[model samples]
Target: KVFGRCELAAAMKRHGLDNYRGYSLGNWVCAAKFESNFNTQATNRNTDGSTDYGILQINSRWWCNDGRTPGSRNLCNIPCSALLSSDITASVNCAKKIVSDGNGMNAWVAWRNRCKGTDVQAWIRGCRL
Candidate 1:
Protein backbone atom coordinates (compact mmCIF):
# COMPACT_ATOMS: atom_id res chain seq x y z
CA LYS A 1 0.00 0.00 0.00
CA VAL A 2 1.27 3.44 -0.86
CA PHE A 3 -0.35 5.24 2.07
CA GLY A 4 -1.69 4.74 5.57
CA ARG A 5 -3.93 7.63 6.53
CA CYS A 6 -1.03 9.82 7.62
CA GLU A 7 0.88 9.48 4.40
CA LEU A 8 -2.42 9.68 2.54
CA ALA A 9 -3.24 13.05 4.07
CA ALA A 10 0.14 14.42 3.10
CA ALA A 11 -0.09 12.89 -0.35
CA MET A 12 -3.56 14.30 -0.90
CA LYS A 13 -2.34 17.74 0.08
CA ARG A 14 0.74 17.32 -2.08
CA HIS A 15 -1.54 16.42 -4.94
CA GLY A 16 -3.39 19.73 -4.29
CA LEU A 17 -6.52 17.91 -3.23
CA ASP A 18 -7.33 19.91 -0.13
CA ASN A 19 -10.76 20.20 -1.64
CA TYR A 20 -12.22 18.80 -4.81
CA ARG A 21 -15.83 19.35 -5.79
CA GLY A 22 -16.33 20.55 -2.23
CA TYR A 23 -15.42 17.23 -0.66
CA SER A 24 -12.87 17.34 2.13
CA LEU A 25 -9.55 15.52 2.49
CA GLY A 26 -11.01 13.47 5.32
CA ASN A 27 -13.76 12.31 2.99
CA TRP A 28 -11.23 10.96 0.51
CA VAL A 29 -9.23 9.33 3.28
CA CYS A 30 -12.32 7.66 4.63
CA ALA A 31 -13.29 6.52 1.17
CA ALA A 32 -9.83 5.12 0.56
CA LYS A 33 -9.89 3.29 3.87
CA PHE A 34 -13.20 1.63 3.17
CA GLU A 35 -12.62 1.11 -0.54
CA SER A 36 -9.10 -0.32 -0.59
CA ASN A 37 -7.35 0.52 2.66
CA PHE A 38 -4.84 2.44 0.60
CA ASN A 39 -3.93 -0.58 -1.52
CA THR A 40 -3.21 0.61 -5.05
CA GLN A 41 -3.88 -2.65 -6.85
CA ALA A 42 -7.23 -3.23 -5.26
CA THR A 43 -10.18 -4.34 -7.37
CA ASN A 44 -13.53 -5.73 -6.23
CA ARG A 45 -16.13 -7.57 -8.24
CA ASN A 46 -19.74 -6.52 -7.85
CA THR A 47 -22.61 -9.00 -7.70
CA ASP A 48 -23.73 -7.79 -11.12
CA GLY A 49 -20.34 -8.89 -12.60
CA SER A 50 -19.05 -5.36 -12.99
CA THR A 51 -15.88 -4.51 -11.06
CA ASP A 52 -14.81 -1.53 -9.01
CA TYR A 53 -11.51 0.01 -10.06
CA GLY A 54 -8.63 1.08 -7.88
CA ILE A 55 -8.48 2.99 -4.60
CA LEU A 56 -11.52 5.09 -5.48
CA GLN A 57 -13.47 1.96 -6.35
CA ILE A 58 -14.64 3.56 -9.59
CA ASN A 59 -17.07 1.29 -11.37
CA SER A 60 -16.22 -0.33 -14.66
CA ARG A 61 -19.82 0.27 -15.69
CA TRP A 62 -18.95 3.85 -16.46
CA TRP A 63 -15.54 5.22 -15.60
CA CYS A 64 -13.25 2.64 -17.15
CA ASN A 65 -13.31 -0.22 -19.65
CA ASP A 66 -13.31 -3.79 -18.39
CA GLY A 67 -13.80 -5.63 -21.71
CA ARG A 68 -16.56 -7.72 -20.14
CA THR A 69 -18.84 -4.71 -19.88
CA PRO A 70 -20.20 -3.60 -23.20
CA GLY A 71 -21.18 0.01 -23.90
CA SER A 72 -19.29 1.30 -20.93
CA ARG A 73 -19.33 5.06 -20.57
CA ASN A 74 -15.53 5.14 -20.24
CA LEU A 75 -15.47 8.80 -19.30
CA CYS A 76 -11.81 8.49 -18.43
CA ASN A 77 -11.07 6.44 -21.55
CA ILE A 78 -8.82 4.14 -19.56
CA PRO A 79 -8.70 0.42 -18.99
CA CYS A 80 -10.03 -0.57 -15.61
CA SER A 81 -6.99 -2.69 -14.97
CA ALA A 82 -4.73 0.31 -15.40
CA LEU A 83 -6.26 1.87 -12.32
CA LEU A 84 -4.99 -1.06 -10.32
CA SER A 85 -1.42 0.00 -9.96
CA SER A 86 1.12 1.13 -7.37
CA ASP A 87 0.89 4.60 -8.89
CA ILE A 88 -2.23 6.66 -8.05
CA THR A 89 -2.00 9.40 -10.67
CA ALA A 90 -4.45 7.80 -13.05
CA SER A 91 -6.86 6.92 -10.30
CA VAL A 92 -6.80 10.42 -8.87
CA ASN A 93 -7.38 12.00 -12.23
CA CYS A 94 -10.30 9.72 -12.98
CA ALA A 95 -11.78 10.45 -9.58
CA LYS A 96 -11.55 14.17 -10.24
CA LYS A 97 -13.53 13.80 -13.42
CA ILE A 98 -16.11 11.70 -11.67
CA VAL A 99 -16.48 14.37 -9.05
CA SER A 100 -16.65 17.13 -11.61
CA ASP A 101 -19.27 15.20 -13.50
CA GLY A 102 -21.55 16.04 -10.57
CA ASN A 103 -21.41 12.83 -8.56
CA GLY A 104 -18.73 14.13 -6.24
CA MET A 105 -17.84 11.45 -3.69
CA ASN A 106 -21.26 9.89 -4.12
CA ALA A 107 -19.83 7.96 -7.06
CA TRP A 108 -18.54 5.41 -4.55
CA VAL A 109 -21.07 3.47 -2.52
CA ALA A 110 -18.57 3.24 0.31
CA TRP A 111 -18.31 6.98 0.45
CA ARG A 112 -22.06 7.62 0.27
CA ASN A 113 -22.83 4.98 2.87
CA ARG A 114 -19.87 5.47 5.20
CA CYS A 115 -18.18 8.80 4.73
CA LYS A 116 -21.14 11.04 4.03
CA GLY A 117 -22.11 13.47 6.77
CA THR A 118 -20.08 11.56 9.33
CA ASP A 119 -17.47 13.01 11.66
CA VAL A 120 -14.62 11.79 9.40
CA GLN A 121 -12.16 13.51 11.68
CA ALA A 122 -10.72 10.24 12.91
CA TRP A 123 -9.46 9.51 9.43
CA ILE A 124 -6.57 11.88 10.08
CA ARG A 125 -6.79 12.26 13.85
CA GLY A 126 -3.38 10.88 14.71
CA CYS A 127 -1.79 11.05 11.31
CA ARG A 128 1.19 13.32 11.67
CA LEU A 129 2.71 14.60 8.45
Candidate 2:
Protein backbone atom coordinates (compact mmCIF):
# COMPACT_ATOMS: atom_id res chain seq x y z
CA LYS A 1 0.00 0.00 0.00
CA VAL A 2 2.97 2.28 0.31
CA PHE A 3 3.14 2.95 -3.40
CA GLY A 4 -0.57 3.49 -3.63
CA ARG A 5 -0.46 5.83 -0.64
CA CYS A 6 2.45 7.70 -2.16
CA GLU A 7 0.72 8.08 -5.51
CA LEU A 8 -2.69 8.78 -4.09
CA ALA A 9 -1.32 11.37 -1.69
CA ALA A 10 0.46 13.00 -4.58
CA ALA A 11 -2.67 12.95 -6.67
CA MET A 12 -4.73 14.27 -3.79
CA LYS A 13 -2.34 17.14 -3.12
CA ARG A 14 -1.61 17.85 -6.77
CA HIS A 15 -5.32 18.13 -7.41
CA GLY A 16 -5.79 20.52 -4.45
CA LEU A 17 -7.54 17.85 -2.47
CA ASP A 18 -5.22 17.72 0.52
CA ASN A 19 -7.79 19.64 2.47
CA TYR A 20 -10.69 18.28 0.49
CA ARG A 21 -13.82 18.37 2.57
CA GLY A 22 -11.56 18.22 5.59
CA TYR A 23 -10.30 14.75 4.80
CA SER A 24 -7.05 15.24 6.70
CA LEU A 25 -3.79 13.38 6.43
CA GLY A 26 -4.87 10.90 9.04
CA ASN A 27 -8.16 10.50 7.31
CA TRP A 28 -6.44 9.82 4.04
CA VAL A 29 -4.10 7.42 5.71
CA CYS A 30 -7.05 5.74 7.31
CA ALA A 31 -8.71 5.68 3.94
CA ALA A 32 -5.81 4.03 2.19
CA LYS A 33 -5.45 1.56 4.99
CA PHE A 34 -9.05 0.53 4.66
CA GLU A 35 -9.33 0.76 0.90
CA SER A 36 -6.81 -1.89 -0.08
CA ASN A 37 -5.62 -3.20 3.26
CA PHE A 38 -2.32 -1.45 2.65
CA ASN A 39 -1.53 -3.38 -0.49
CA THR A 40 0.65 -1.00 -2.47
CA GLN A 41 1.23 -3.47 -5.32
CA ALA A 42 -2.32 -4.64 -5.58
CA THR A 43 -3.55 -5.68 -9.02
CA ASN A 44 -6.90 -6.73 -10.38
CA ARG A 45 -5.95 -9.66 -12.50
CA ASN A 46 -7.79 -11.21 -15.41
CA THR A 47 -7.13 -14.36 -17.40
CA ASP A 48 -4.97 -12.47 -19.87
CA GLY A 49 -1.60 -10.86 -19.17
CA SER A 50 -3.05 -7.79 -20.85
CA THR A 51 -4.80 -6.79 -17.65
CA ASP A 52 -1.86 -6.47 -15.26
CA TYR A 53 -2.17 -2.90 -14.04
CA GLY A 54 -0.49 -1.71 -10.87
CA ILE A 55 -1.43 0.01 -7.62
CA LEU A 56 -4.85 1.69 -7.57
CA GLN A 57 -5.52 -1.55 -9.46
CA ILE A 58 -7.04 0.33 -12.36
CA ASN A 59 -7.01 -1.58 -15.60
CA SER A 60 -7.89 -1.51 -19.31
CA ARG A 61 -10.80 0.79 -20.13
CA TRP A 62 -10.54 2.16 -16.59
CA TRP A 63 -10.03 5.57 -18.14
CA CYS A 64 -13.17 5.77 -20.25
CA ASN A 65 -14.80 2.35 -20.24
CA ASP A 66 -15.38 2.40 -23.96
CA GLY A 67 -14.33 0.64 -27.17
CA ARG A 68 -11.62 3.28 -27.26
CA THR A 69 -9.52 1.01 -25.06
CA PRO A 70 -7.02 0.67 -27.88
CA GLY A 71 -6.95 4.43 -28.52
CA SER A 72 -6.75 5.00 -24.76
CA ARG A 73 -4.30 2.18 -24.24
CA ASN A 74 -1.85 4.34 -22.34
CA LEU A 75 -4.14 4.39 -19.33
CA CYS A 76 -4.03 0.60 -19.30
CA ASN A 77 -0.26 0.47 -19.26
CA ILE A 78 1.99 0.78 -16.25
CA PRO A 79 2.57 4.29 -14.81
CA CYS A 80 -0.45 5.98 -16.34
CA SER A 81 0.99 9.50 -16.46
CA ALA A 82 -0.17 9.75 -20.05
CA LEU A 83 -3.60 10.77 -18.83
CA LEU A 84 -4.53 14.35 -19.73
CA SER A 85 -4.86 17.13 -17.17
CA SER A 86 -8.62 17.13 -17.63
CA ASP A 87 -8.58 13.36 -17.34
CA ILE A 88 -6.55 13.62 -14.17
CA THR A 89 -9.09 16.13 -12.92
CA ALA A 90 -11.79 13.68 -13.83
CA SER A 91 -10.01 10.94 -11.90
CA VAL A 92 -9.68 12.99 -8.76
CA ASN A 93 -13.11 14.54 -9.19
CA CYS A 94 -14.64 11.12 -9.54
CA ALA A 95 -12.98 10.02 -6.33
CA LYS A 96 -14.54 12.93 -4.47
CA LYS A 97 -17.71 12.76 -6.49
CA ILE A 98 -18.52 9.30 -5.19
CA VAL A 99 -19.27 10.82 -1.83
CA SER A 100 -22.18 12.68 -3.37
CA ASP A 101 -22.58 11.65 -6.96
CA GLY A 102 -26.21 10.79 -6.17
CA ASN A 103 -25.18 7.12 -6.13
CA GLY A 104 -26.65 6.78 -2.68
CA MET A 105 -24.93 7.10 0.71
CA ASN A 106 -24.07 3.41 0.82
CA ALA A 107 -20.73 3.77 -0.91
CA TRP A 108 -19.44 6.36 1.56
CA VAL A 109 -20.89 4.50 4.49
CA ALA A 110 -19.16 1.32 3.36
CA TRP A 111 -15.93 3.18 2.68
CA ARG A 112 -15.92 4.63 6.18
CA ASN A 113 -16.76 1.20 7.63
CA ARG A 114 -19.77 2.76 9.27
CA CYS A 115 -22.31 0.63 7.50
CA LYS A 116 -25.79 0.64 9.04
CA GLY A 117 -25.04 3.98 10.69
CA THR A 118 -24.50 7.67 10.04
CA ASP A 119 -23.53 8.96 6.58
CA VAL A 120 -20.17 10.66 6.12
CA GLN A 121 -21.28 11.83 2.67
CA ALA A 122 -23.78 14.04 4.44
CA TRP A 123 -20.82 15.64 6.14
CA ILE A 124 -18.79 15.86 2.95
CA ARG A 125 -21.59 17.63 1.07
CA GLY A 126 -21.26 20.63 3.36
CA CYS A 127 -17.87 21.46 1.83
CA ARG A 128 -17.76 19.57 -1.48
CA LEU A 129 -19.39 22.21 -3.67
Candidate 3:
Protein backbone atom coordinates (compact mmCIF):
# COMPACT_ATOMS: atom_id res chain seq x y z
CA LYS A 1 0.00 0.00 0.00
CA VAL A 2 1.29 3.42 -0.92
CA PHE A 3 -0.09 5.88 1.57
CA GLY A 4 -0.95 9.44 0.83
CA ARG A 5 0.89 11.94 3.03
CA CYS A 6 -1.98 12.68 5.33
CA GLU A 7 -3.15 9.09 5.44
CA LEU A 8 0.26 7.98 6.51
CA ALA A 9 0.41 10.75 9.10
CA ALA A 10 -2.93 9.72 10.56
CA ALA A 11 -1.88 6.11 10.72
CA MET A 12 1.42 6.94 12.39
CA LYS A 13 -0.33 9.17 14.86
CA ARG A 14 -2.80 6.40 15.71
CA HIS A 15 0.11 4.11 16.44
CA GLY A 16 1.62 6.62 18.92
CA LEU A 17 4.32 7.99 16.67
CA ASP A 18 3.06 11.54 17.05
CA ASN A 19 5.67 12.31 19.69
CA TYR A 20 7.56 9.14 20.21
CA ARG A 21 11.07 9.78 21.52
CA GLY A 22 10.68 13.52 21.29
CA TYR A 23 10.48 13.26 17.53
CA SER A 24 7.34 14.78 16.03
CA LEU A 25 4.98 13.01 13.68
CA GLY A 26 6.38 14.92 10.77
CA ASN A 27 9.84 13.57 11.43
CA TRP A 28 8.50 10.11 10.90
CA VAL A 29 6.38 11.12 7.95
CA CYS A 30 9.30 12.80 6.32
CA ALA A 31 11.52 9.80 6.81
CA ALA A 32 8.88 7.52 5.38
CA LYS A 33 8.47 9.75 2.38
CA PHE A 34 12.12 9.43 1.47
CA GLU A 35 12.74 5.95 2.79
CA SER A 36 10.08 4.18 0.80
CA ASN A 37 7.67 6.78 -0.52
CA PHE A 38 5.14 5.52 1.99
CA ASN A 39 4.96 2.14 0.26
CA THR A 40 4.47 -0.70 2.69
CA GLN A 41 5.79 -3.28 0.28
CA ALA A 42 9.01 -1.47 -0.55
CA THR A 43 12.20 -3.45 -0.33
CA ASN A 44 15.81 -2.67 -1.13
CA ARG A 45 18.80 -4.95 -1.05
CA ASN A 46 22.11 -3.54 0.06
CA THR A 47 25.48 -4.45 -1.34
CA ASP A 48 26.48 -5.64 2.10
CA GLY A 49 24.21 -8.69 2.04
CA SER A 50 21.45 -6.95 3.95
CA THR A 51 18.03 -5.79 2.90
CA ASP A 52 15.80 -2.96 3.99
CA TYR A 53 12.07 -3.55 4.18
CA GLY A 54 8.84 -1.59 4.37
CA ILE A 55 7.90 2.07 4.68
CA LEU A 56 10.52 2.98 7.23
CA GLN A 57 13.01 0.70 5.55
CA ILE A 58 13.80 -1.42 8.57
CA ASN A 59 16.91 -3.39 7.81
CA SER A 60 17.38 -7.15 7.80
CA ARG A 61 20.89 -6.73 9.16
CA TRP A 62 19.81 -5.89 12.67
CA TRP A 63 16.08 -5.40 13.03
CA CYS A 64 14.37 -8.28 11.22
CA ASN A 65 15.31 -11.82 10.27
CA ASP A 66 15.16 -12.68 6.58
CA GLY A 67 17.21 -15.88 6.66
CA ARG A 68 19.69 -14.21 4.38
CA THR A 69 21.43 -11.39 6.27
CA PRO A 70 24.48 -12.82 7.87
CA GLY A 71 24.58 -12.43 11.68
CA SER A 72 21.19 -10.80 11.78
CA ARG A 73 20.46 -9.80 15.33
CA ASN A 74 16.71 -9.67 14.67
CA LEU A 75 16.28 -7.09 17.41
CA CYS A 76 12.69 -6.62 16.40
CA ASN A 77 12.15 -10.36 16.77
CA ILE A 78 10.09 -10.52 13.61
CA PRO A 79 10.44 -11.82 10.12
CA CYS A 80 11.34 -9.11 7.63
CA SER A 81 8.15 -10.02 5.74
CA ALA A 82 6.10 -8.56 8.59
CA LEU A 83 7.45 -5.13 7.76
CA LEU A 84 6.02 -5.43 4.26
CA SER A 85 2.41 -5.77 5.41
CA SER A 86 -0.03 -3.06 4.50
CA ASP A 87 -1.23 -2.89 8.09
CA ILE A 88 2.04 -1.15 9.10
CA THR A 89 1.62 -1.97 12.78
CA ALA A 90 4.52 -4.35 12.81
CA SER A 91 6.74 -1.91 10.99
CA VAL A 92 5.82 0.93 13.33
CA ASN A 93 6.32 -1.21 16.39
CA CYS A 94 9.70 -2.31 15.23
CA ALA A 95 10.63 1.30 14.59
CA LYS A 96 9.61 2.14 18.13
CA LYS A 97 11.83 -0.59 19.43
CA ILE A 98 14.67 0.81 17.40
CA VAL A 99 14.21 4.21 18.99
CA SER A 100 13.74 2.77 22.45
CA ASP A 101 17.06 1.02 22.05
CA GLY A 102 18.73 4.46 22.10
CA ASN A 103 19.57 4.40 18.44
CA GLY A 104 17.12 7.24 17.90
CA MET A 105 15.75 7.95 14.41
CA ASN A 106 19.32 8.14 13.16
CA ALA A 107 19.13 4.40 12.73
CA TRP A 108 17.65 5.22 9.35
CA VAL A 109 20.15 6.82 7.03
CA ALA A 110 17.42 8.50 5.01
CA TRP A 111 16.19 10.21 8.15
CA ARG A 112 19.71 11.24 8.99
CA ASN A 113 20.48 12.64 5.58
CA ARG A 114 17.14 14.22 4.76
CA CYS A 115 15.14 14.93 7.90
CA LYS A 116 17.77 15.31 10.60
CA GLY A 117 17.74 19.07 10.85
CA THR A 118 15.01 20.17 8.50
CA ASP A 119 11.55 21.55 9.12
CA VAL A 120 10.01 18.12 8.97
CA GLN A 121 6.57 19.53 9.68
CA ALA A 122 6.44 20.42 6.01
CA TRP A 123 6.17 16.76 5.31
CA ILE A 124 2.78 16.69 6.99
CA ARG A 125 1.60 20.13 6.07
CA GLY A 126 -2.17 20.53 5.67
CA CYS A 127 -2.75 17.13 7.23
CA ARG A 128 -5.58 17.22 9.75
CA LEU A 129 -3.88 15.72 12.72
Q: Identify the candidate with maximal lDDT.
A: 3
The C-alpha RMSD of each candidate to the native structure, in angstroms, is 1.6, 8.4, 0.9
- Give the per-residue Cα lDDT of candidate 2 at 35: 46
lDDT of 2 by residue, 1-129 (tens): 243444555555676666566554334434434544445444343444333222222334443332324434433233433222323454445445544444432343324573234332332232323
Q: How much is 23 displaced in model 3, in angstroms?
A: 0.2
Highest TM-score: which candidate? 3
Per-candidate TM-score against the hidden true structure:
0.89, 0.39, 0.96
- Over 104-128, each residue of candidate 1 has an lDDT whose tens digit, in order, gives 7787888889899999877878877
Off by over 4 Å in 3: none
Task: Report every candidate's CA lDDT.
Answer: 0.82, 0.41, 0.94
Candidate ordering by lDDT (highest first): 3, 1, 2
Candidate 2 lDDT: 0.41
